[PDB]
RNA sequence: GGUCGCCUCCUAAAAGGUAACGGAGGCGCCCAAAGGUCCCCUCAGGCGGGACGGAAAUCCGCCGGAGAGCGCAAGGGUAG
RNA sequence: UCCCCCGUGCCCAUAGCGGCGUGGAACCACCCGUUCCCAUUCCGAACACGGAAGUGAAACGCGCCAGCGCCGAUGGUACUGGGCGGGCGACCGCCUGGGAGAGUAGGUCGGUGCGGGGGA
RNA sequence: CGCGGGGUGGAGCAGCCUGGUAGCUCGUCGGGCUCAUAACCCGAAGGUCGUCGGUUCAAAUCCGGCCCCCGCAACCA
RNA sequence: CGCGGGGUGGAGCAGCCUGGUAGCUCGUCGGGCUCAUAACCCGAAGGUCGUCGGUUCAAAUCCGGCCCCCGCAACCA
């Protein structure tokens, strides 16, 4: 479909290591990335400016996909929040577009962050998936300083077929996910 | 994010723009420039990446800076509070460490004035 | 109804007869009501518009 | 003083008291119990009164069980007023007891001690009563 | 893909602050970065960098022993 | 618990069953497509046409059209002409559509 | 003094109906979409994981038959 | 006319949850691809189309086991249509016919209809 | 239902008859004087002149519609 | 027993009708003036709205019960 870097490392290096490590019988048993979802939980743009599209153009830039809106489920008073208010962005990366984002993340994003000292090991799902948080977003290379108004974080979730954290730990560690402890 | 992790001000001279890191002062600025033959009066924008890459890879390695620095400073203070030295007690109360008068002033160590009837 | 939820007639633009009577919120939908409706007189359909009750 | 913490409804219709007890007819906790012989609305005042009497009798010792609870709101119209103009007010709570219902139980106190204590208790209750010992029949239930 | 809202994705060349050329794909065909996957101190084995033992402390401070045992 | 698959199925099937007509049901596997006609009163298939049974092949849509046409042949012979189309969990489109389009000019009334 | 028409529930004694100044609540509106249809989707809640972010904003995972929602009181109904 | 599979009804958990095992010849499914039809408030996940390299890992089909869930007698009793008796009274009791709920024994890892494909 | 006249800065407001100026008082800001307080005095910010369409070189000023507050009188099976 | 009103910073009162936002005077505390006190000037703190429930995204504000205070009523015999 498209020859890419990280997909090669998975298929030509990560795969076999996993097999010899847990002794998978069948081929599809071998754990693999299903999808990567980015979610900028804004709501800072609630009643406020529709200039969440600045964060949206910034988003589509990083991912190469157009981001969708997320709106208020229930209204909450303590949050100054009306049910239906636009309060976030979410974009779902699958197949090749996933592989590209992950390559630029493990290689260029994650190092360029202030005082990187490893990903949290305990942050594993319990049924094979993994979650992390960024606060910057100029951290991605295609975002120069001039494009930014104010900072903005995002919620990355990465989903694998791994039955458990162990298998998941390995699939990620082997790809290039640097862990802290 | 450029050096060491946070983008120093462009458009302003090198000797100056260096200072804007948690670890560098005018002293290390005056110096670090010389040890890579950087023009001391050249603006950050004027810097060729030839000059940049050399002064980037220099300073990151040469000194403890920023977060790692601050965490080390913070870890330094924690040590005082645990053993129970006088300076450790003075950090526990938030009071002046370096041996001072507290009858007047000392307000930087204990913030806003807290008047009582 | 109320001062705000008002009553009104729908008048056929073709032949000016009022053939239907209904309501609307004046605040919510403040424009005259445009609607296709069967006209018994013209014996076809017709754009009918709002008309003061 | 027993009474519900909260209540779905405040006033409750009176009802009849047909039949023997619906259940709660076998000793389930201690060795001796007090059984209702005739039916009644047992007031929250009476429950408490019996309770205290036993407690007092074997001062410090044994454990008292109470197998009945006043959840029925008892109504009373004011003095010297006429019929009609609404239902009276709630003025207390009763527990509806029926023959066969074990109402109290005691344990970990000597046989003679239990007998007197449960006996005094019954004297506070508006009905005829009998004491009973835990049986093979009870444990079978 | 529901195109007409998505930014094109051409091959990109991210040469970093260590000359390390990494070709890939991205919205921008030309982009630069400082530290990278290769030359990051956490990534490279461990790297002393400038953190060796948190200064000449504490019992390993030396500069003393006024004794002749 | 229910897949959206099953929910769609019931939802579109029930509606048709209420109109009381004969029912042209359809299965659309990755490799074949099948179409039987059912009297839900008695609970019985009256006539059936399929790719597998036709021993047919040559691009799914163009294939699908024929099984419809073939279905009409055996149907009209038996007396069946009036019918309702169970489009199953599948969007009326492409392959399923072609089956309908064929079965239509094949003579079926729907 | 309270009440006076309409609706929901109990009283009402397993069809319908049934009184009291019996026990509890509602209505005198509303919606040009909150209407017609075609197509698609499935809740609440719990646990785990997730920058700002909390009991609760938005995202991921597993569980979950309906305890959610259905403008409004209650009942019945209802995710086939 | 026995066996396996596919589509589809009926009985509406004795059919379900969970666990363990089995199945790719065929069917079916994941699967391969995004040119075309169609599609995503973002994503070929879904819907859709063109395919057949791989795999039964998932899903599904078929088994097996009774932890859960579900079903659940007989016997006895509550209550009761009708007919009566005792007690000042509260309430009890009798004949006749009907007869639960709970619980006990115990059952259950479905049964069947019509069509299609493939077998011995 | 039928009449009569208003909307002008934060509050009240003559400018409208007679088309060339968004003006007045009070309000807030700064400065002067002050035992201070007020009052006095100098300056200053602050408006699409209800809307939309229209005659006009130009109109808050003049017209048509419309919104809204007050007002006038009558009717209420 | 009935009907109407009320409970909000230490005192005395607004805000509730129309849900989102807590005001006024006094007192109090800190700093000025004065030899000192007051008057006077500057600056500040202080309530989680009687108490339980309920409605609502949200309750001093809307709804039910209870407690305390206030006014009216209580007649025909
Ligand atoms: Mg591709
Ligand atoms: Mg491999
Ligand atoms: Mg926010
Ligand atoms: Mg560094
Ligand atoms: Mg400290
Ligand atoms: Mg000072
Ligand atoms: Mg016409
Ligand atoms: Mg109007
Ligand atoms: Mg017309
Ligand atoms: Mg309690
Ligand atoms: Mg009785
Ligand atoms: Mg009984
Ligand atoms: Mg009885
Ligand atoms: Mg009896
Ligand atoms: Mg009982
Ligand atoms: Mg004892
Ligand atoms: Mg007695
Ligand atoms: Mg006994
Ligand atoms: Mg015994
Ligand atoms: Mg037992
Ligand atoms: Mg490299
Ligand atoms: Mg290493
Ligand atoms: Mg279920
Ligand atoms: Mg569905
Ligand atoms: Mg549906
Ligand atoms: Mg049948
Ligand atoms: Mg052919
Ligand atoms: Mg044709
Ligand atoms: Mg025909
Ligand atoms: Mg009256
Ligand atoms: Mg009846
Ligand atoms: Mg509306
Ligand atoms: Mg749709
Ligand atoms: Mg949809
Ligand atoms: Mg949830
Ligand atoms: Mg959570
Ligand atoms: Mg959260
Ligand atoms: Mg915050
Ligand atoms: Mg979500
Ligand atoms: Mg429930
Ligand atoms: Mg909800
Ligand atoms: Mg439901
Ligand atoms: Mg419901
Ligand atoms: Mg046979
Ligand atoms: Mg079957
Ligand atoms: Mg059956
Ligand atoms: Mg079932
Ligand atoms: Mg199990
Ligand atoms: Mg087992
Ligand atoms: Mg085994
Ligand atoms: Mg086995
Ligand atoms: Mg085996
Ligand atoms: Mg094969
Ligand atoms: Mg092609
Ligand atoms: Mg194309
Ligand atoms: Mg095309
Ligand atoms: Mg279309
Ligand atoms: Mg299209
Ligand atoms: Mg949108
Ligand atoms: Mg769209
Ligand atoms: Mg299986
Ligand atoms: Mg077992
Ligand atoms: Mg069992
Ligand atoms: Mg059942
Ligand atoms: Mg029986
Ligand atoms: Mg019998
Ligand atoms: Mg009988
Ligand atoms: Mg009888
Ligand atoms: Mg009798
Ligand atoms: Mg008698
Ligand atoms: Mg008797
Ligand atoms: Mg007899
Ligand atoms: Mg007899
Ligand atoms: Mg009998
Ligand atoms: Mg009998
Ligand atoms: Mg069995
Ligand atoms: Mg079973
Ligand atoms: Mg089973
Ligand atoms: Mg069997
Ligand atoms: Mg048979
Ligand atoms: Mg005036
Ligand atoms: Mg009054
Ligand atoms: Mg009143
Ligand atoms: Mg009053
Ligand atoms: Mg009162
Ligand atoms: Mg009150
Ligand atoms: Mg108040
Ligand atoms: Mg007060
Ligand atoms: Mg007053
Ligand atoms: Mg009030
Ligand atoms: Mg009011
Ligand atoms: Mg003072
Ligand atoms: Mg003085
Ligand atoms: Mg509340
Ligand atoms: Mg409030
Ligand atoms: Mg409250
Ligand atoms: Mg209150
Ligand atoms: Mg109250
Ligand atoms: Mg008189
Ligand atoms: Mg008289
Ligand atoms: Zn007409
Ligand atoms: Zn590099």
Swiss-Prot record, chain A:
**Any GO molecular function:** rRNA binding
Q: Does the keyword RNA-binding apply?
A: yes
Cellular component GO terms held in the UniProt record: ribonucleoprotein complex; ribosome
Is Ribonucleoprotein given among the entry's keywords?
yes
InterPro entries assigned to the protein according to its UniProt record, in alphabetical order: Ribosomal_uL5, Ribosomal_uL5_bac-type, Ribosomal_uL5_C, Ribosomal_uL5_CS, Ribosomal_uL5_dom_sf, Ribosomal_uL5_N
Q: Which Pfam families match?
A: Ribosomal_L5, Ribosomal_L5_C
* One GO term (biological process): translation
Quaternary data: Part of the 50S ribosomal subunit; part of the 5S rRNA/L5/L18/L25 subcomplex. Contacts the 5S rRNA and the P site tRNA. Forms a bridge to the 30S subunit in the 70S ribosome.
Q: Which HAMAP family match?
A: Ribosomal_uL5_B
| Family statement | Belongs to the universal ribosomal protein uL5 family.
Entry protein name: Large ribosomal subunit protein uL5
Question: What species is given as this protein's source?
Answer: Thermus thermophilus (strain ATCC BAA-163 / DSM 7039 / HB27)
Curated annotation (Swiss-Prot), chain B:
Region of interest (Disordered), residue spans: 94-117
Show the coiled coil region(s): none
Q: Which domain of life is it from?
A: Bacteria
Keywords assigned by UniProt? Answer: Ribonucleoprotein, Ribosomal protein, RNA-binding, rRNA-binding, tRNA-binding
Q: Name one GO biological process term.
A: translation
Gene Ontology molecular-function annotations: rRNA binding; structural constituent of ribosome; tRNA binding
The record's section on Pfam families has:
Ribosomal_S13
Give the CC-aspect GO terms. Answer: cytosol; small ribosomal subunit
**Role:** Located at the top of the head of the 30S subunit, it contacts several helices of the 16S rRNA. In the 70S ribosome it contacts the 23S rRNA (bridge B1a) and protein L5 of the 50S subunit (bridge B1b), connecting the 2 subunits; these bridges are implicated in subunit movement. Contacts the tRNAs in the A and P-sites.
Q: How does it assemble?
A: Part of the 30S ribosomal subunit. Forms a loose heterodimer with protein S19. Forms two bridges to the 50S subunit in the 70S ribosome.
Concerning its family, UniProt says: Belongs to the universal ribosomal protein uS13 family.
Instruction: Tell me which HAMAP family the record gives.
Output: Ribosomal_uS13 (MF_01315)
Q: What is this protein called?
A: Small ribosomal subunit protein uS13
UniProtKB/Swiss-Prot annotation, chain D:
Q: What is the annotated signal peptide range for this record?
A: none
Q: What is this protein called?
A: Large ribosomal subunit protein uL16
Which keywords describe this protein according to UniProt?
Ribonucleoprotein, Ribosomal protein, RNA-binding, rRNA-binding, tRNA-binding
What's the domain of life for this entry? Bacteria
Q: Name one GO molecular function term.
A: rRNA binding
Q: Which GO terms describe its cellular component?
A: cytosolic large ribosomal subunit
Function recorded in the entry: Binds 23S rRNA and is also seen to make contacts with the A and possibly P site tRNAs.
How would you summarize the oligomeric state and partners of this protein?
Part of the 50S ribosomal subunit.
Would I find tRNA-binding among this entry's keywords? yes
NCBIfam families the UniProt entry points to: rplP_bact
Q: Which family does it belong to?
A: Belongs to the universal ribosomal protein uL16 family.
| One of the GO biological process terms | translation
Gene3D superfamilies assigned to the protein according to its UniProt record, in alphabetical order: Ribosomal protein L10e/L16
User: Entry's PANTHER family?
Assistant: 50S/60S RIBOSOMAL PROTEIN L16, LARGE RIBOSOMAL SUBUNIT PROTEIN UL16M
Tell me which InterPro entries the record gives: Ribosomal_uL16, Ribosomal_uL16_bact-type, Ribosomal_uL16_dom, Ribosomal_uL16_sf
Q: Which HAMAP family match?
A: Ribosomal_uL16 (MF_01342)
Q: Which organism is it from?
A: Thermus thermophilus (strain ATCC BAA-163 / DSM 7039 / HB27)
The UniProt entry, under CDD domains, shows:
Ribosomal_L16_L10e
From Swiss-Prot, chain F:
Cited InterPro entries:
Ribosomal_uL18_bac-type, Ribosomal_uL18_bac/euk
List the GO cellular component terms. cytosolic large ribosomal subunit
Q: Which UniProt keywords apply?
A: Ribonucleoprotein, Ribosomal protein, RNA-binding, rRNA-binding
User: GO molecular function: any one?
Assistant: structural constituent of ribosome
Q: Name one Pfam family in it.
A: Ribosomal_L18p
Q: Name one GO biological process term.
A: translation
What is stated as this protein's family in its record? Belongs to the universal ribosomal protein uL18 family.
> Its function?
This is one of the proteins that bind and probably mediate the attachment of the 5S RNA into the large ribosomal subunit, where it forms part of the central protuberance.
List, alphabetically, the PANTHER family matched: 39S RIBOSOMAL PROTEIN L18, MITOCHONDRIAL, LARGE RIBOSOMAL SUBUNIT PROTEIN UL18M
Assembly notes:
Part of the 50S ribosomal subunit; part of the 5S rRNA/L5/L18/L25 subcomplex. Contacts the 5S and 23S rRNAs.
| Protein name, as recorded | Large ribosomal subunit protein uL18
